[PDB]
Short mmCIF file of C-alpha atoms and ligand atoms in Angstrom, two decimals:
data_model
loop_
_atom_site.label_atom_id
_atom_site.label_comp_id
_atom_site.label_asym_id
_atom_site.label_seq_id
_atom_site.Cartn_x
_atom_site.Cartn_y
_atom_site.Cartn_z
CA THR A 3 88.37 107.35 84.89
CA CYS A 4 89.79 103.97 83.90
CA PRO A 5 92.79 104.13 81.55
CA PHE A 6 92.69 102.20 78.25
CA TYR A 7 95.58 99.88 79.19
CA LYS A 8 93.36 98.30 81.95
CA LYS A 9 90.61 97.41 79.50
CA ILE A 10 90.39 94.16 77.48
CA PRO A 11 88.80 95.05 74.05
CA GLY A 12 85.91 92.91 72.88
CA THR A 13 85.04 91.83 76.33
CA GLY A 14 83.29 93.17 79.38
CA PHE A 15 86.55 92.81 81.35
CA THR A 16 89.00 95.06 83.22
CA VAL A 17 92.29 94.19 84.93
CA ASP A 18 93.44 95.71 88.22
CA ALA A 19 90.79 98.52 87.94
CA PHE A 20 89.05 98.86 91.35
CA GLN A 21 89.81 102.58 92.03
CA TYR A 22 87.60 104.11 89.31
CA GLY A 23 84.09 103.45 90.68
CA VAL A 24 81.67 101.49 88.49
CA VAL A 25 83.42 101.09 85.13
CA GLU A 26 80.90 101.52 82.34
CA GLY A 27 80.33 98.19 80.62
CA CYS A 28 82.46 96.12 82.98
CA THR A 29 80.81 92.75 83.81
CA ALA A 30 83.80 91.10 85.53
CA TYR A 31 86.79 92.58 87.32
CA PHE A 32 90.06 90.61 87.28
CA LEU A 33 92.74 91.04 89.99
CA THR A 34 96.25 89.77 89.08
CA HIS A 35 97.71 89.91 92.67
CA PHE A 36 97.28 91.36 96.15
CA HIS A 37 99.47 94.58 95.99
CA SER A 38 97.88 97.84 97.04
CA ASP A 39 98.45 99.78 93.73
CA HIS A 40 96.47 96.99 92.06
CA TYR A 41 93.64 96.16 94.59
CA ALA A 42 93.10 99.88 95.53
CA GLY A 43 89.33 100.31 95.93
CA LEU A 44 88.20 96.82 97.03
CA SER A 45 86.28 96.31 100.39
CA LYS A 46 83.32 94.51 102.01
CA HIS A 47 80.97 96.86 100.04
CA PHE A 48 82.19 95.64 96.62
CA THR A 49 79.28 93.80 94.84
CA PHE A 50 80.66 92.90 91.36
CA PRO A 51 82.21 89.49 90.42
CA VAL A 52 86.02 89.51 91.10
CA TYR A 53 88.08 86.80 89.34
CA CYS A 54 91.52 85.88 90.75
CA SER A 55 93.73 83.03 92.08
CA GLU A 56 92.83 80.93 95.15
CA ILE A 57 95.55 82.72 97.22
CA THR A 58 94.43 86.21 96.16
CA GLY A 59 90.86 85.02 97.04
CA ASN A 60 91.96 84.08 100.61
CA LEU A 61 93.48 87.57 101.06
CA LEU A 62 90.33 89.34 99.74
CA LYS A 63 88.08 87.38 102.19
CA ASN A 64 90.33 87.69 105.32
CA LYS A 65 92.18 90.98 104.93
CA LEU A 66 89.74 93.24 103.07
CA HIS A 67 86.51 91.29 104.10
CA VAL A 68 85.10 91.02 100.63
CA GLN A 69 82.03 88.83 100.78
CA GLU A 70 82.50 85.24 99.66
CA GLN A 71 79.60 85.27 97.15
CA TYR A 72 81.50 87.82 94.98
CA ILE A 73 84.91 85.99 95.04
CA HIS A 74 85.51 83.77 92.03
CA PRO A 75 88.82 81.92 92.48
CA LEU A 76 90.15 79.94 89.45
CA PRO A 77 92.67 77.10 89.37
CA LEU A 78 95.92 77.67 87.53
CA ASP A 79 96.88 76.15 84.16
CA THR A 80 93.23 75.28 83.43
CA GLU A 81 90.91 76.48 80.65
CA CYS A 82 87.88 78.24 82.26
CA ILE A 83 84.80 80.08 80.76
CA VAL A 84 84.00 83.50 82.18
CA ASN A 85 80.94 85.30 80.77
CA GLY A 86 81.27 83.32 77.59
CA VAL A 87 85.05 83.91 77.10
CA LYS A 88 87.82 81.28 77.58
CA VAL A 89 90.54 82.35 80.02
CA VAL A 90 93.58 80.74 81.62
CA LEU A 91 95.55 81.87 84.72
CA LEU A 92 99.34 81.26 84.70
CA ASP A 93 101.96 81.65 87.42
CA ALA A 94 103.55 85.13 87.16
CA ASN A 95 106.72 84.40 89.28
CA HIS A 96 105.90 87.62 91.30
CA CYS A 97 104.44 87.43 94.93
CA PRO A 98 102.28 84.57 96.27
CA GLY A 99 99.03 84.27 94.32
CA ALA A 100 100.22 86.47 91.40
CA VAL A 101 98.99 85.47 87.92
CA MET A 102 99.18 86.41 84.21
CA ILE A 103 95.85 86.07 82.33
CA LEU A 104 95.40 84.61 78.80
CA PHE A 105 92.12 85.79 77.11
CA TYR A 106 90.79 83.95 73.99
CA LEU A 107 88.52 86.51 72.31
CA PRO A 108 85.44 85.36 70.45
CA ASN A 109 86.84 86.85 67.18
CA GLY A 110 90.09 84.67 67.33
CA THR A 111 92.39 87.28 68.90
CA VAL A 112 94.54 86.06 71.82
CA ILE A 113 95.67 88.52 74.52
CA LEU A 114 98.23 87.93 77.34
CA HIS A 115 98.16 90.33 80.36
CA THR A 116 101.27 89.73 82.45
CA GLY A 117 100.12 91.52 85.59
CA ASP A 118 103.35 92.09 87.53
CA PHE A 119 105.90 89.34 86.60
CA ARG A 120 109.50 88.18 86.66
CA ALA A 121 110.04 86.53 83.25
CA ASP A 122 111.61 83.14 83.32
CA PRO A 123 112.51 80.51 80.66
CA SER A 124 110.14 78.05 82.48
CA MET A 125 107.24 80.11 81.10
CA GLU A 126 108.32 79.03 77.52
CA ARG A 127 106.87 75.59 78.50
CA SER A 128 103.52 76.54 79.99
CA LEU A 129 100.25 76.69 77.92
CA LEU A 130 101.81 79.76 76.22
CA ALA A 131 103.75 77.47 73.93
CA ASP A 132 100.50 76.15 72.34
CA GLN A 133 99.20 79.16 70.35
CA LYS A 134 99.96 82.50 68.93
CA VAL A 135 99.53 85.71 70.98
CA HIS A 136 98.45 88.89 69.17
CA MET A 137 98.54 91.52 71.97
CA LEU A 138 100.78 91.61 75.12
CA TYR A 139 99.97 93.91 78.07
CA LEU A 140 103.48 94.02 79.58
CA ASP A 141 104.98 94.77 83.04
CA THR A 142 107.67 97.18 81.85
CA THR A 143 108.87 98.24 85.43
CA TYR A 144 112.62 97.77 84.55
CA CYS A 145 112.47 98.25 80.74
CA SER A 146 115.98 99.81 80.33
CA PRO A 147 119.36 98.09 79.97
CA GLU A 148 120.80 99.63 83.16
CA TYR A 149 118.56 97.33 85.16
CA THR A 150 120.64 94.19 85.83
CA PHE A 151 120.31 92.23 89.05
CA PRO A 152 121.37 88.77 90.20
CA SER A 153 119.17 85.63 90.31
CA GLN A 154 116.96 85.16 93.36
CA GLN A 155 118.99 82.08 94.23
CA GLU A 156 122.37 84.03 94.39
CA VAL A 157 120.73 86.73 96.56
CA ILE A 158 119.37 84.09 99.05
CA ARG A 159 122.79 82.40 99.11
CA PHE A 160 124.35 85.72 100.12
CA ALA A 161 121.70 86.37 102.78
CA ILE A 162 121.89 82.85 104.40
CA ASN A 163 125.77 82.94 104.45
CA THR A 164 125.89 86.44 105.98
CA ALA A 165 123.28 85.66 108.70
CA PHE A 166 124.74 82.26 109.61
CA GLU A 167 128.27 83.74 109.96
CA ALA A 168 127.13 86.66 112.07
CA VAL A 169 125.05 84.62 114.58
CA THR A 170 127.68 81.93 114.85
CA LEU A 171 130.28 84.60 115.73
CA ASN A 172 127.83 86.20 118.20
CA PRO A 173 124.97 84.00 119.52
CA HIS A 174 123.51 87.17 121.02
CA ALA A 175 122.90 88.91 117.64
CA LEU A 176 119.31 89.36 116.42
CA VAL A 177 118.43 89.29 112.69
CA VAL A 178 115.70 91.69 111.49
CA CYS A 179 114.07 91.65 108.02
CA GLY A 180 111.89 94.50 106.66
CA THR A 181 108.49 93.94 104.90
CA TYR A 182 105.53 96.09 103.72
CA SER A 183 103.52 93.86 101.44
CA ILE A 184 103.38 90.19 100.48
CA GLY A 185 106.28 88.95 98.38
CA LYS A 186 109.95 88.13 99.07
CA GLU A 187 109.03 85.60 101.87
CA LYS A 188 112.04 83.41 100.89
CA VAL A 189 114.38 86.08 102.38
CA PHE A 190 113.21 85.69 106.00
CA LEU A 191 112.18 82.04 105.70
CA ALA A 192 115.59 80.94 104.36
CA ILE A 193 117.51 82.83 107.09
CA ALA A 194 115.27 81.33 109.84
CA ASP A 195 115.75 77.79 108.38
CA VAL A 196 119.58 78.10 108.54
CA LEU A 197 119.48 79.44 112.13
CA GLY A 198 116.99 76.78 113.44
CA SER A 199 114.54 79.55 114.48
CA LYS A 200 110.94 80.48 113.65
CA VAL A 201 110.24 83.96 112.28
CA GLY A 202 108.59 86.28 114.74
CA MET A 203 106.10 88.89 113.65
CA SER A 204 102.97 90.95 114.47
CA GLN A 205 99.55 89.30 114.58
CA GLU A 206 98.48 91.30 111.43
CA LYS A 207 101.45 89.96 109.44
CA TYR A 208 100.99 86.41 110.78
CA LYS A 209 97.33 86.54 109.56
CA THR A 210 98.49 87.66 106.09
CA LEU A 211 101.00 84.75 105.82
CA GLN A 212 98.36 82.22 106.95
CA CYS A 213 96.35 83.03 103.78
CA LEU A 214 99.26 81.99 101.40
CA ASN A 215 99.15 78.12 101.12
CA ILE A 216 102.87 77.91 101.91
CA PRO A 217 103.65 74.31 103.01
CA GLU A 218 104.63 73.71 106.59
CA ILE A 219 104.04 77.37 107.55
CA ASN A 220 102.88 76.59 111.10
CA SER A 221 106.47 75.15 111.36
CA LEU A 222 108.27 78.41 110.25
CA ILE A 223 106.42 81.46 111.68
CA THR A 224 105.14 82.63 115.09
CA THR A 225 103.73 85.61 117.03
CA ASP A 226 105.94 84.84 120.02
CA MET A 227 108.78 87.22 119.51
CA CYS A 228 110.60 86.13 122.69
CA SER A 229 111.08 82.65 121.24
CA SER A 230 112.48 83.81 117.81
CA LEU A 231 115.86 85.28 116.76
CA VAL A 232 114.64 86.38 113.34
CA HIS A 233 112.12 89.25 113.61
CA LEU A 234 110.00 90.87 110.86
CA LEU A 235 109.36 94.62 111.13
CA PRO A 236 107.76 97.22 108.87
CA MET A 237 110.08 98.46 106.11
CA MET A 238 109.91 101.99 107.56
CA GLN A 239 111.50 100.88 110.81
CA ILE A 240 114.62 99.53 108.97
CA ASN A 241 116.90 102.46 109.92
CA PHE A 242 119.33 103.14 112.79
CA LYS A 243 116.70 104.91 115.01
CA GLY A 244 114.02 102.26 114.51
CA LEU A 245 116.40 99.37 115.10
CA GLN A 246 117.98 100.96 118.27
CA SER A 247 114.43 101.23 119.65
CA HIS A 248 113.55 97.67 118.81
CA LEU A 249 116.77 96.41 120.48
CA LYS A 250 115.70 98.17 123.73
CA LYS A 251 112.41 96.23 123.62
CA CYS A 252 114.16 92.85 123.68
CA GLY A 253 115.17 93.33 127.33
CA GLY A 254 118.90 92.67 127.06
CA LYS A 255 118.44 89.28 125.29
CA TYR A 256 120.48 90.69 122.36
CA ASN A 257 123.44 93.04 122.00
CA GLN A 258 123.71 93.43 118.14
CA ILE A 259 121.30 93.68 115.12
CA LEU A 260 121.96 92.50 111.61
CA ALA A 261 119.10 93.81 109.34
CA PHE A 262 118.06 93.20 105.72
CA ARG A 263 116.12 95.57 103.34
CA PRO A 264 115.14 93.60 100.21
CA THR A 265 114.82 96.42 97.64
CA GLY A 266 114.20 95.88 93.86
CA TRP A 267 117.01 97.79 92.03
CA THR A 268 119.47 100.32 93.39
CA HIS A 269 122.39 101.89 91.25
CA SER A 270 125.03 100.08 93.36
CA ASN A 271 123.98 97.24 90.86
CA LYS A 272 125.70 98.93 87.86
CA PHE A 273 129.10 98.76 89.55
CA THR A 274 129.05 96.19 92.34
CA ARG A 275 128.56 92.37 92.30
CA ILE A 276 126.40 90.56 94.93
CA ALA A 277 129.53 88.97 96.42
CA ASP A 278 130.92 92.49 97.05
CA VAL A 279 127.86 94.03 98.82
CA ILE A 280 128.61 95.66 102.19
CA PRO A 281 126.34 97.06 104.91
CA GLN A 282 125.80 100.47 106.45
CA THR A 283 126.99 100.22 110.05
CA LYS A 284 126.48 102.38 113.17
CA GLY A 285 127.71 101.02 116.48
CA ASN A 286 126.25 97.51 117.00
CA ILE A 287 123.69 97.82 114.09
CA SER A 288 124.42 96.77 110.47
CA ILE A 289 121.86 97.23 107.55
CA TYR A 290 122.19 95.30 104.26
CA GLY A 291 120.32 96.45 101.12
CA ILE A 292 119.92 93.29 99.00
CA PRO A 293 118.66 93.44 95.31
CA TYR A 294 115.93 90.76 95.61
CA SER A 295 113.61 91.45 92.65
CA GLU A 296 110.13 90.12 91.83
CA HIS A 297 110.10 91.94 88.50
CA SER A 298 111.94 90.99 85.16
CA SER A 299 115.39 92.40 84.58
CA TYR A 300 115.83 94.11 81.17
CA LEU A 301 117.44 90.99 79.73
CA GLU A 302 114.78 88.55 81.12
CA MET A 303 112.05 90.84 79.73
CA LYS A 304 113.68 91.00 76.29
CA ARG A 305 114.16 87.18 76.12
CA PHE A 306 110.46 86.60 76.94
CA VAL A 307 109.17 89.04 74.37
CA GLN A 308 111.57 87.85 71.57
CA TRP A 309 110.33 84.22 72.31
CA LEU A 310 106.60 85.17 72.41
CA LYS A 311 106.73 87.37 69.28
CA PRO A 312 103.58 89.44 69.88
CA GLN A 313 102.07 91.56 67.11
CA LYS A 314 101.39 94.56 69.46
CA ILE A 315 102.86 95.51 72.97
CA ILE A 316 100.93 97.68 75.43
CA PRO A 317 103.13 98.78 78.42
CA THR A 318 101.39 98.88 81.89
CA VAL A 319 104.30 100.57 83.85
CA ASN A 320 106.19 103.88 83.28
CA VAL A 321 103.43 105.09 80.97
CA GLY A 322 103.03 108.58 82.51
CA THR A 323 105.86 110.41 80.72
CA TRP A 324 106.55 110.99 77.03
CA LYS A 325 110.29 110.30 77.52
CA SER A 326 109.54 106.93 79.20
CA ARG A 327 107.01 105.92 76.57
CA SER A 328 109.41 106.88 73.70
CA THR A 329 112.28 104.96 75.33
CA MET A 330 110.24 101.73 75.70
CA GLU A 331 108.88 101.93 72.13
CA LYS A 332 112.48 102.22 70.84
CA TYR A 333 113.47 99.02 72.68
CA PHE A 334 110.40 97.14 71.44
CA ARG A 335 111.43 98.00 67.82
CA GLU A 336 115.02 96.95 68.37
CA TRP A 337 113.85 93.60 69.77
CA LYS A 338 111.58 92.96 66.87
CA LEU A 339 114.24 93.84 64.24
CA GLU A 340 116.91 91.76 65.95
CA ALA A 341 114.63 88.68 66.21
CA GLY A 342 112.85 89.12 62.85
CA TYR A 343 109.10 89.07 63.71
NI1 NI B 401 103.20 93.96 92.36
#
């Protein structure tokens, strides 16, 4: 049964609620982004109206085969009317196609659902600036002060510099990047751009990237692995056994692998700076864990909320334990007392 924190009161709407069968009273189903924990349940047999971004709509049609007549894509930053309720989709700074959703209830209440997001000061100048928000449904993934990580830009600087140095020392090294979902495309695209290579990948993954409206993509990716020196593999194969095996398959073209695992947070963050990150090495294989996040750090989250000043916060992540819930509620109170709302 659908939990309360996926329901929008005073509407017929749910958010990211496709795994519960027919939700009683739901007249439209919103989907914030194409990640499996959120889309779980959608297929070609779905016959209710789904409302989402253009990019999420492309993925629904091509990857899950949802029928076109049930896909309702909306433009960003534009006031739209859905079943008699004004809504606006905003960029969530998460994966491609990811949105937050502003709902303007018929009684005057205004709700923001963040979906999954990485808060940024740029959001303080969207259509959020223009009215008060009463209730916030918040991505609380890293809602604890131990979660610090660098900017995306510092992480890509590290990755480009490391790859360029390694391949310039050894023109026979191959770079491998792990993936298991959309998101974090800048990692492998930035490395390929510095090396003057296209990214090589499976046909399934190529199909997925072709749905993303990324400019000049035919220029950056390919299914011809033999022509590429940056290869994308499943995240599960990013280990010494999986990489040894892949290196065999390249037929003696390469004699070394440098690999990247973009994680979110890992406790090496508490102590070590990005500049100081070192790989795990075995023989001619090195594996770098890099803290590339698509969710808010604790500080980014706190800045957003203290700027928005919502009357009520509803967490959407870490809600399954009493200790987690109590911890987040204590931070929300601190923030409110410090800022004065
Ligand atoms: Ni997500």
